[model samples]
Target: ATFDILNKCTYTVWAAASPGGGRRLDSGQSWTITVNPGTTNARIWGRTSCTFDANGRGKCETGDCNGLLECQGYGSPPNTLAEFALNQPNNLDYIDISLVDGFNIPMDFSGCRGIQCSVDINGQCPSELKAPGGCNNPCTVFKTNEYCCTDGPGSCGPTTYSKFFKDRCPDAYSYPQDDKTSLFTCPSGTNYKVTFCP
Candidate 1:
C-alpha cells in the first residue's frame, strides 16, 4: 500500500522511512512512499532544520540519521515516531505515534479513525528532558533498565518522564509498556496519511 506524508509546517521537513526510504518535502507538499503489504517494524519520522551537501551528507536539527540525507535506519532521539505493522496474522494493521523516544514535531496519522497530537510540546518540555531540537524520553536520557524496560514491558513502569509525554499525546506511546491505550489496529488495506505539524 501507499503511505502519504503531508508537510503542513511552515518550513521544510526531511522525512525518513525505515526499510522504505526518504523524502524532502517543503511546506504544503506531500509524498507517497510505498511499503509492502506485510511489512513489520516499518516507521516514518520528520527531520527539521536540515542542510545537506552535494553528496547528500548533512545533518538535521532533529531526527538526523548519521548525517545522511537519505536515512537507511532510525533517526536520533527527540523525534516523533510513526510506527506500523501491516497485514498481520488477522489481516490487521497496527499503527501508532511513539513518544517513547521523544517529541520533536506535532503530528497526526489519519485514514483509520485518525490519531494526532497538535500540541506544541517543545516550549513546555521540561528542562531536564530537553534536547537540541525537541524533548527526550527518560530511556534516551538514562539508558537504564528502569527507563528502557530492557528486560520486558512488564519490568518497567511509568515515571515522571513518561507521564510528561503521555499527558500531552494521549494517543501515543509514552513508554515501552504504554500499549494499552496507544497501539491502534485497523483492517488491512486502509489508506494512511502521516501529517507533520498537524
Candidate 2:
C-alpha cells in the first residue's frame, strides 16, 4: 500500500519513512511512498529547522537522521513518531503516535476517528526537558531506568516525565509499556496518512 506523507506545518518539514525511504516536504505539500505488501514496523516522522547542501546532506534542529536528507536510518531523539504494522494476519493494522522518544513536531495518523493533537505543546515544555525544536520526553533527558524503562515490560511505570506527555497527547504512547492508551488498530488495506503539525 502507499502511505501519504502530508505537511501541514507552516515551516519546512523533512519527512522520513523508515525502511521505506524519505522526502522533503514543504508547507502544504505532500509525498507518497509505497510499502511492501506485508510491511511491519514501518514508521514515519518529521524533522524541522533543517539546512541541506546540494548533495542532500545536512542536519535538522530536531529528528536528524544521521544528517542525511533522505534519512537512511531513524531520526534522533525528540521526534514525533507514527509507527505502524501493516497487513498483518486477521486484517489488522496497528498504529500509534509515540512520545516515548519525545515530541518534536505535532503528528497524528488516520483510522478509528483519525487521531491528532488538539494543541501545540512545545511552548509549555518543562524547562528541564526543553530543547531547540520540541519537548524531550523524560526518558530522553533522565535516561534513568525508571524514565527509560530499559529493563523490560515489568520494569517501570509512569513518572512525572511521562505523565507530562500523556496529559497532552493522551492517545500517544507516553512510555514504552503504555499499551492500553496508545495502540490503535485498523483493518488491513487501509490507506494511512501521517500528517505533521495537524
Candidate 3:
C-alpha cells in the first residue's frame, strides 16, 4: 500500500512514519511512502515547531522521533496519529485517527471510510495538559493507570481528560479502550491519504 501524506497547515510539518520513515512538508506540499502489504503497527503523524540542520539533526517541539529528520522509532507524544495495520485478519486493513498519544496537528485519514480530527484542541487544552506545540494526553501528564490503561481494558476506562478529547474529535481514539467507535477497516490493498491540518 502507498501513503500520500499531505500538509495543509499554513506552517511546516515534519511528517513522520514508523515503517515508512519521515519527510518535511511545507504548506500545500506532500510526501509519498510505500508500505509492505502485511505491515503492522504502522503510524503516521506530524511534528511541529521543528528545526533541523542540513544533516537532518535537530528537534521538534512536538512529535520528535529521536531528534532525526528521518525517524528511526515512534515519535514522542502530543501528536495526532494516523495508525493502521494493513492486510490483517479477513483481508482487512484496520485504521484509526488516534489521540491516544495526545494531539498536535489536526489530521484526516482517507481510504475506505475517511476519519478526521480537525478540532484545534491546543487552543482549548487544559492548563495541566498543555505543551509547547500540542496538548498532552492525561496518561502522558499523570502517568496513572486510570489514564494510561497500562493494566489493560479490564482495569481502565475513560477519564475527564479522555472525554475532553472525545468530545472534540469523536472519530478519534481518545483512550486505549476507545476501540468501539474509533476503529475502522478497509479492504486489503487499499492506498491511503493522510492530510495534516485538514
Candidate 4:
C-alpha cells in the first residue's frame, strides 16, 4: 500500500534486496535498495532517490524507477482454526455478516491502475475469507467471510479492504439521506452476513 514513483538515482534503484533472511528471498546473496535517506526515498514512489524514465529509460536497476501500479491502503482479518468451525446454519453466534446496500468499484482511475488491496484489523479479525474444506486449492476462491490485510514481509502485501471500506464509507453502517454521504453498516440490505471468530 505504501509505495511511490521511482526515479533514476542510487537509493531509488530496486537493487533487489535479499528476498528475506531465507533460502528463497534471502538464501545467500541478495539484492536490496540501500536506503540512504534522500537517496533511496527519491528512488521509490512514496519516497526514493531513483530517477524516472518517462522519456528514454535505461536499465531497471535495483532502485531503478518503475510505474506506480496502485497505492495500497488497509488489510483484512487473519484466518484461524476457530473460523473453520463456523458452520453454515448456526454461524450468527458472534457477529453479523451481510451484504451492504450497494457495491462500488471506486478507484483513482478506472479500466486500469487502481489495485485491489485486502483489509486487516487489530482487536478483532476483519471479515471471514473462505477457501474450502478437505482440499485447499480445490475450493472455489471466494470470501469465506474472512477479511485481512496483506503487505507481507519483503513481499507486496499488507493491502487492506477495511481501509477501502473506511475510505468509501467513513461512518460505516448508516441510514441513507441527502445531507451526509458516507455510512458504516447498512440498517437494511442484502449483505452476506456479520460474523465473529473465536
Candidate 5:
C-alpha cells in the first residue's frame, strides 16, 4: 500500500496488461494496502489490483519484500512480504503475500483450496496443474495410507519424489531409488513412507 499503518509512506508501481480470471473473479482492478516497500519491512496487506502468474506463481524481489513475521511451515515455511525484503538475496519481482488487509490475522485465502498436480508423460511431476476432484484418498480420516499409495501397491504417499532417497530413507547417505520405484514400509514406522507433500 502507498501509506503506512499510521498513514505515512508511499511507493509507485507500473501496471501491466493482464488477462482476467474471468467471471468468477473481477479483472482490471487495482488496490493499495499497508505494504511498505521499506521500513515495516513487512507489508502483510496488499489492497491493489495484482496480476498473479497464470499458474499462481508470484515472486517478490527478495530481501526487498521481507515481512514482520514468519510462519516457518511447509518445510521452509511462508514468510511475510516485509520479511521477504530483508532476507532476499536478489532483486525479485514477486513477493509472497495474502489478500487479508490486517496483519497477524486469518487471511482471506486458501492454500490448497484450488491446488492440483499430476505426473507428466516422462513421469516427471507437473510444475503446476489443477486436479479434477471426485475421489478422496489417503487424506480421509479412516482410509489412512490404505488409499494414499499411488503405485497401486503398499500404502504410500508422495505423488512426486522429494528425491527418492529423501522420501524412503531421509537419513540414507545417498538417493537409492528411481522415480519409478515404490516402497512398502509402514507409514507409522518411519517418516520415509509418507510426507505431508506429494
Candidate 6:
C-alpha cells in the first residue's frame, strides 16, 4: 500500500515514518511511501520546528528520532501518530490515529473509514501537560501504570488526562486499550492518505 502524507499546515513539518524513513514537507507539499504487504507496527508522524544540516542531522521540537532526518526508529513523545498493521487477520488492515504518545499536530487518515483528530489541543492543553510544541500524554508526564497501561488493559482505565484527549479526538485513541471506538479496519492493500493540520 502507498501512504501519501500531505502537509496542509501553514508551516513546514518534518514527516517521519518508521521503516520508511523521513522527509521535509513544506506547506502544500507531500511525501509518499510504499509499504509491502504484511507490515506491522508501522507509524507516521510529523515533527515541528526542525533544523537540519547538510548531513540531515538536527533536532525537532517534537518527534525527533535519533536526530536523523531519515528516522530509523520511533519518534519522541508528544507526537500525533497514524499507525497501521497491514494484512492482519481476516485479510484486513488495522489503522488508527493514536494520542497514546500524545498529540503535536492535527491529523486525518483517509481510507475505508476516514478518521481525524484536528482539534487545537496545544492551545487548550492543561497546564501540567503542556509541552513546548504539543500536549504531553499522561503516560509521558506520569509513569504510573494507570496512565501508561504498563500493567496491561485489565489494570488501566481512563483518567482525567485521557479524557482531555478523548474529548478532542473521539475517533482517535486517547489512551491504550481504546479499541472499542478508535480502532478501524480496511481490506488489505488499501491505499491511505495522511493529512497533517487537517
Per-candidate Cα lDDT values, in order, are 0.89, 0.84, 0.93, 0.19, 0.21, 0.94
Q: What's the TM-score of every candidate structure? A: 0.96, 0.94, 0.98, 0.15, 0.17, 0.98
Best by lDDT: 6
Per-residue error for 139 in candidate 3, Å, reads 0.9
Kindly list the per-residue Cα lDDT of model 3 for residues 1-198, writing each as its tens digit.
999999999999999998877899999999999988888999999999899999999999999999899998899999999999999989999999999898999999999888999987999999999998999989888988998888866688879999999999999999888899999999998899999988
Candidate 2 stretches greater than 4 Å from native:
none
Residue pairs in candidate 3 whose N, alpha carbon or C atoms collide under 3 angstroms: none
Can you write out model 4's per-residue Cα lDDT over 73-126, one digit (the tens) per residue? 111111110000111242211111111212111111001112221122221223
Where does model 1 exceed 4 Å of error?
Answer: none
Any idea how many clashes model 3 has? 0
Ranking of all predicted structures according to lDDT, beginning with the best and ending with the worst: 6, 3, 1, 2, 5, 4
In angstroms, give how far residue 63 of model 3 lies from its true place.
0.5
Kindly report the root-mean-square deviation of model 5 from the true structure over all alpha carbons.
18.3
Per-residue lDDT over 79-98 for candidate 5, one digit per residue giving the tens place of the 0 to 100 score: 11111232122322222222
Q: How many residue pairs clash (N, CA or C atoms closer than 3 angstroms) in each of the candidate models, in the order given?
A: 0, 0, 0, 94, 32, 0
Q: How far off is residue 87 in model 5, in Å?
A: 9.2
Name the regions of candidate 6 deviating beyond 4 angstroms: none
Question: Higher-TM-score candidate among 4 and 6?
Answer: 6
- For candidate 6, write residues 113-157 as lDDT tens digits: 789999899999999899999999999999989888888657888
Model 5, residue 136: what's the lDDT? 15
Instruction: List, residue by residue over 1-198, the lDDT tens digit for candidate 2.
Output: 667889998888989988766688899999988876577877889988889999989889998989998877788889889888887888788889898877888886886558775467798888988989988888888878898878887799988888888988899999888988889888777788888877
